[PDB]
């Protein structure tokens, strides 16, 4: 009904007045206005057929109005080359303001949405070539900025993976980054990212965002793919970092650490647990699974890195804290 | 029972396991004892009766001994030395690897200063000293890259990594310094004490996974929790001055703190239940999982690999 | 479902969505009026490709769909496709091999021989960069070894270099950097001893190569003089 185009009607007069009403507010829409209008819309898009009427709708709109796909990519790249500007008193660092931060975070909702809704919404609006909207934000998640911004990076991130050569390009991307710290880092004792965020940061906050959307996207990319020869040259290949680091540091957290929600104390174990089990599901076994080799990593004969399948299940047929903790998990519930 | 007492002669300073992989399922069951009070001390390594498998001569004597990788041990000796050696397993010989020979030496005056503690985050080693001086090493440099001159006109005890790039260090009066290794300045960021009292700190421990838990011991035998955010929790524990305490790696709920009295309490949060494990002064302890080891100065190795049975 | 947003599309986008159906030709139309170049479209094809090598029935099923929408087993069919696009709309700049043998390598697919040979007399270099780019050590090794000989005399043809020690000194060029980068590589730890025979042939190989040089020189100053 938000939607204007042997049944289907020449436009109905209500549509029409309604499809009016959803441009009419758009036109020299004050800055008080800017969120309920994109909480509005971003209710508007479900409904596959409707989220690709109303893609198309407000991408023309924005063909000046500050609901444009310029000005939010524009947007971006100005905070991008701000928060470069000030890396090391670099001048005060204007920490986006709460309302900024706002409406950062009503933009990416309903960026995440459309593209969930609409696949040519997602392949139309990872290819623009002025926007590219996946280096920008693969550029800012390095950078200083709260939590609940990093959050929402990483599920627009997702929302842009159910797509299976963007996950190809995105696991290039990602390990060429160093997001998550899987190459010692000239000596990177623990972790650059992911790791020291959650220890220090996340931990002293008592809620644990960055690490459910974290696990998020990794469910999100091994879906796709298990991926393959994730890095050469730069470590060894294969997917075992993600997965030693998955596995010890949230499993840790599962048992002890302060909460300030108590319900937050499962999530964080639900989602470790559903990789696991993703990752466990398509493992079959192989006869060369049970043949090693071993990889001389800086002149140290390192065994390699079995598939996960195998060090998956090697610790469950033993009673290693990983099987203890799900009987555990298990009495609990 | 649990526990079997292999007497040595030498008075057991120091007692820390080697670091084991965490994705392979093995068991602890290498570790690593100092020695102190005698002419020749040593640094010993021993496998679980506890059958001692290499030992080198130590000049001066091992105050505080860590385990930087399975194959590097750092040892401060009482000279202020800080030495590195290299375990070959495969010839059972310790060597040695590099040496600070001054690294702490008290200003001014001629002779020796003792290296009270050194923590270690490879590569990076932070010794403190009685000396104000907060001398920070690196595993390859022949080099001090940073030294803190007259951090403590009071002997320091303790130190320990905080978040990262930062020190607590604990003093002869009573006070839990924050310091910081980027800045350039040489005065703490925070100082905290208690109210009224200049009780000497000897201990100081960080809770494994959250880091602004952190346990110190005075000489009053009290264990005082304290938050570094926000002392939380004062607890009445021993009649004597605690030397040691220390979390529980695997299971952070346990706690055990060793006394000179002669008491290996153990504290278990999972009402806090205390027990008594052994029945003249326990110097260190150390805990992996279900393995413990403590070094008396009855020159005794008390090990058990039953710690939760 | 498209036929809705095809309403509202742009070269890219339209370029993309045809390009994920498998639909090569009517790409590669619409990129060559607006003059973009088609890089994507090669790369898509040589992704599809590896995608079969190593697959299951559905995946052979949907080939043979593609494969008729585009024109003795469905593989063979996208082989030869891709060798016909590949030479016929050939472009001299970045479409030829450098995009298809990037996205190989990254997938960990042993190179077919047609595209190893056609890179190497174009361009060695390059390959010989990605070769020692990724963790392919022994193949860079074999490659430098390929080279040296033909600036010698025996297989220049190959290499694409007129100048066996013959005439005057006009044509050389020998990747120092690369062959540097590879020595550390193989000396990093002195522990394999395998690692450590191949430096010491090249190595041996490459004096063999210089002293030829230098007598190269002493000849044509010589005959300058």
Request: a negative charge; charged letters at 20%; glycine letters at 6%.
């Given at each position: 009904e938000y939607w204007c185009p042997v049944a289907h009607q020449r436009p109905p007069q209500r549509q029409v007045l309604l499809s009016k009403f959803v441009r009419q507010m758009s036109d020299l829409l004050p800055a008080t206005l800017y969120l309920p209008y994109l909480k509005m819309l971003r209710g508007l898009a479900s409904?596959?057929?409707?989220?690709?009427?109303?893609?198309?709708?407000?991408?023309?709109?924005?063909?000046?109005?500050?609901?444009?796909?310029?000005?939010?990519?524009?947007?971006?790249?100005?905070?991008?080359?701000?928060?470069?500007?000030?890396?090391?008193?670099?001048?005060?660092?204007?920490?986006?303001?709460?309302?900024?931060?706002?409406?950062?975070?009503?933009?990416?909702?309903?960026?995440?949405?459309?593209?969930?809704?609409?696949?040519?919404?997602?392949?139309?609006?990872?290819?623009?070539?002025?926007?590219?909207?996946?280096?920008?934000?693969?550029?800012?998640?390095?950078?200083?900025?709260?939590?609940?911004?990093?959050?929402?990076?990483?599920?627009?991130?997702?929302?842009?993976?159910?797509?299976?050569?963007?996950?190809?390009?995105?696991?290039?991307?990602?390990?060429?980054?160093?997001?998550?710290?899987?190459?010692?880092?000239?000596?990177?004792?623990?972790?650059?990212?992911?790791?020291?965020?959650?220890?220090?940061?996340?931990?002293?906050?008592?809620?644990?965002?960055?690490?459910?959307?974290?696990?998020?996207?990794?469910?999100?990319?091994?879906?796709?793919?298990?991926?393959?020869?994730?890095?050469?040259?730069?470590?060894?290949?294969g997917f075992e970092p993600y997965l030693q680091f998955l596995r010890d540091t949230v499993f840790l957290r599962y048992r002890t650490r302060a909460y300030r929600r108590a319900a937050e104390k499962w999530e964080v174990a639900e989602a470790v647990l559903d990789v696991f089990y993703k990752l466990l599901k398509d493992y079959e076994p192989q006869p060369e699974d049970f043949v090693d080799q071993y990889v001389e990593l800086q002149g140290e004969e390192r065994v390699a890195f079995k598939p996960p399948g195998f060090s998956l299940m090697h610790h469950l047929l033993n009673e290693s804290p990983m099987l203890e903790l799900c009987l555990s998990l298990m009495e609990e519930g | 029972?649990?526990?079997?007492?292999?007497?040595?002669?030498?008075?057991?300073?120091?007692?820390?396991?080697?670091?084991?992989?965490?994705?392979?399922?093995?068991?602890?069951?290498?570790?690593?004892?100092?020695?102190?009070?005698?002419?020749?001390?040593?640094?010993?390594?021993?496998?679980?009766?506890?059958?001692?498998?290499?030992?080198?001569?130590?000049?001066?004597?091992?105050?505080?001994?860590?385990?930087?990788?399975?194959?590097?041990?750092?040892?401060?000796?009482?000279?202020?030395?800080?030495?590195?050696?290299?375990?070959?397993?495969?010839?059972?010989?310790?060597?040695?690897?590099?040496?600070?020979?001054?690294?702490?030496?008290?200003?001014?005056?001629?002779?020796?200063?003792?290296?009270?503690?050194?923590?270690?985050?490879?590569?990076?080693?932070v010794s403190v000293g009685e000396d104000g001086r907060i001398n920070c090493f690196r595993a390859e440099s022949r080099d001090v890259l940073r030294t803190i001159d007259d951090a403590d006109s009071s002997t320091m005890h303790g130190v320990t990594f905080l978040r990262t790039t930062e020190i607590l260090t604990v003093n002869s009066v009573g006070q839990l310094k924050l310091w910081d290794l980027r800045k350039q300045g040489n005065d703490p960021t925070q100082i905290f004490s208690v109210t009224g009292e200049r009780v000497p700190l000897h201990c100081v421990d960080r809770h494994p996974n959250q880091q602004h838990v952190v346990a110190t011991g005075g000489q009053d035998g009290m264990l005082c929790i304290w938050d570094v955010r926000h002392p939380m929790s004062l607890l009445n524990a021993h009649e004597a001055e605690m030397w040691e305490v220390h979390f529980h790696p695997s299971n952070p709920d346990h706690l055990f703190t060793c006394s000179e009295d002669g008491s290996l309490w153990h504290w278990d949060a999972s009402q806090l239940e205390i027990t008594n494990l052994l029945p003249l002064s326990v110097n260190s302890l150390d805990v992996l999982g279900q393995n413990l080891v403590c070094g008396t100065d009855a020159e005794a190795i008390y090990v058990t690999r039953r710690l939760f049975s | 479902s498209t036929a809705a947003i095809a309403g509202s599309s742009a070269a890219e986008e339209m370029v993309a969505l045809l390009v994920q159906a498998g639909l090569f030709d009517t790409a590669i139309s619409l990129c060559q009026t607006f003059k973009l170049?088609?890089?994507?479209?090669?790369?898509?094809?040589?992704?599809?490709?590896?995608?079969?090598?190593?697959?299951?029935?559905?995946?052979?099923?949907?080939?043979?769909?593609?494969?008729?929408?585009?024109?003795?087993?469905?593989?063979?069919?996208?082989?030869?496709?891709?060798?016909?696009?590949?030479?016929?709309?050939?472009?001299?700049?970045?479409?030829?091999?450098?995009?298809?043998?990037?996205?190989?390598?990254?997938?960990?697919?042993?190179?077919?021989?047609?595209?190893?040979?056609?890179?190497?007399?174009?361009?060695?270099?390059?390959?010989?960069?990605?070769?020692?780019?990724?963790?392919?050590?022994?193949?860079?090794?074999?490659?430098?070894?390929?080279?040296?000989?033909?600036?010698?005399?025996?297989?220049?043809?190959?290499?694409?270099?007129?100048?066996?020690?013959?005439?005057?000194?006009?044509?050389?060029?020998?990747?120092?950097?690369?062959?540097?980068?590879?020595?550390?590589?193989?000396?990093?730890?002195?522990?394999?001893?395998?690692?450590?025979?191949?430096?010491?042939?090249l190595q041996r190989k490459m004096d063999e190569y210089f002293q030829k040089l230098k007598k190269a020189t002493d000849d044509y100053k010589k005959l300058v003089q």
């Amino acid at each position: 009904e938000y939607w204007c185009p042997v049944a289907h009607q020449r436009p109905p007069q209500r549509q029409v007045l309604l499809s009016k009403f959803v441009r009419q507010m758009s036109d020299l829409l004050p800055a008080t206005l800017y969120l309920p209008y994109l909480k509005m819309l971003r209710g508007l898009a479900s409904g596959p057929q409707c989220a690709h009427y109303c893609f198309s709708l407000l991408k023309a709109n924005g063909g000046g109005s500050p609901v444009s796909w310029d000005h939010f990519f524009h947007s971006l790249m100005l905070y991008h080359e701000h928060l470069r500007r000030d890396l090391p008193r670099h001048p005060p660092l204007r920490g986006i303001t709460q309302r900024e931060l706002d409406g950062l975070i009503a933009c990416l909702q309903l960026t995440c949405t459309i593209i969930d809704w609409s696949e040519s919404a997602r392949l139309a609006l990872c290819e623009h070539a002025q926007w590219m909207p996946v280096v920008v934000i693969l550029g800012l998640l390095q950078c200083s900025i709260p939590p609940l911004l990093k959050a929402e990076l990483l599920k627009t991130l997702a929302a842009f993976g159910k797509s299976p050569e963007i996950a190809a390009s995105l696991w290039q991307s990602l390990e060429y980054t160093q997001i998550l710290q899987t190459v010692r880092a000239t000596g990177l004792r623990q972790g650059v990212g992911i790791e020291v965020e959650l220890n220090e940061i996340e931990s002293r906050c008592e809620e644990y965002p960055l690490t459910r959307a974290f696990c998020q996207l990794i469910s999100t990319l091994v879906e796709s793919s298990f991926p393959t020869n994730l890095g050469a040259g730069l470590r060894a290949p294969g997917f075992e970092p993600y997965l030693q680091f998955l596995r010890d540091t949230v499993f840790l957290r599962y048992r002890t650490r302060a909460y300030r929600r108590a319900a937050e104390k499962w999530e964080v174990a639900e989602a470790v647990l559903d990789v696991f089990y993703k990752l466990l599901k398509d493992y079959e076994p192989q006869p060369e699974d049970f043949v090693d080799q071993y990889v001389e990593l800086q002149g140290e004969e390192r065994v390699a890195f079995k598939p996960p399948g195998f060090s998956l299940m090697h610790h469950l047929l033993n009673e290693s804290p990983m099987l203890e903790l799900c009987l555990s998990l298990m009495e609990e519930g | 029972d649990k526990f079997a007492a292999k007497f040595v002669s030498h008075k057991i300073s120091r007692t820390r396991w080697r670091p084991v992989s965490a994705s392979s399922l093995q068991q602890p069951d290498v570790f690593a004892t100092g020695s102190w009070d005698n002419e020749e001390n040593k640094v010993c390594v021993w496998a679980t009766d506890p059958k001692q498998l290499c030992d080198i001569k130590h000049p001066g004597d091992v105050m505080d001994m860590q385990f930087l990788d399975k194959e590097r041990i750092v040892t401060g000796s009482s000279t202020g030395t800080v030495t590195i050696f290299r375990h070959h397993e495969n010839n059972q010989t310790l060597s040695v690897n590099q040496r600070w020979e001054q690294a702490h030496y008290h200003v001014g005056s001629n002779m020796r200063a003792p290296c009270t503690a050194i923590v270690c985050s490879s590569p990076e080693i932070v010794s403190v000293g009685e000396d104000g001086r907060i001398n920070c090493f690196r595993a390859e440099s022949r080099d001090v890259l940073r030294t803190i001159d007259d951090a403590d006109s009071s002997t320091m005890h303790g130190v320990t990594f905080l978040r990262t790039t930062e020190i607590l260090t604990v003093n002869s009066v009573g006070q839990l310094k924050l310091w910081d290794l980027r800045k350039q300045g040489n005065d703490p960021t925070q100082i905290f004490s208690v109210t009224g009292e200049r009780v000497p700190l000897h201990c100081v421990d960080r809770h494994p996974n959250q880091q602004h838990v952190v346990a110190t011991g005075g000489q009053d035998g009290m264990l005082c929790i304290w938050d570094v955010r926000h002392p939380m929790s004062l607890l009445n524990a021993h009649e004597a001055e605690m030397w040691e305490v220390h979390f529980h790696p695997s299971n952070p709920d346990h706690l055990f703190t060793c006394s000179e009295d002669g008491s290996l309490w153990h504290w278990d949060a999972s009402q806090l239940e205390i027990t008594n494990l052994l029945p003249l002064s326990v110097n260190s302890l150390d805990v992996l999982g279900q393995n413990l080891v403590c070094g008396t100065d009855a020159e005794a190795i008390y090990v058990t690999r039953r710690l939760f049975s | 479902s498209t036929a809705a947003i095809a309403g509202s599309s742009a070269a890219e986008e339209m370029v993309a969505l045809l390009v994920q159906a498998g639909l090569f030709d009517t790409a590669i139309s619409l990129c060559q009026t607006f003059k973009l170049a088609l890089t994507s479209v090669f790369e898509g094809l040589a992704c599809k490709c590896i995608r079969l090598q190593q697959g299951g029935e559905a995946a052979q099923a949907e080939a043979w769909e593609w494969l008729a929408a585009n024109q003795s087993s469905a593989t063979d069919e996208a082989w030869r496709l891709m060798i016909s696009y590949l030479d016929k709309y050939e472009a001299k700049n970045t479409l030829y091999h450098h995009c298809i043998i990037n996205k190989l390598l990254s997938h960990g697919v042993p190179l077919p021989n047609w595209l190893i040979n056609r890179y190497k007399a174009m361009d060695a270099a390059e390959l010989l960069r990605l070769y020692l780019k990724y963790d392919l050590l022994e193949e860079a090794a074999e490659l430098v070894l390929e080279y040296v000989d033909a600036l010698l005399g025996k297989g220049h043809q190959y290499f694409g270099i007129q100048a066996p020690l013959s005439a005057t000194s006009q044509l050389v060029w020998f990747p120092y950097s690369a062959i540097d980068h590879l020595r550390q590589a193989l000396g990093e730890n002195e522990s394999n001893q395998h690692n450590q025979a191949i430096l010491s042939k090249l190595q041996r190989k490459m004096d063999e190569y210089f002293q030829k040089l230098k007598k190269a020189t002493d000849d044509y100053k010589k005959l300058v003089q």
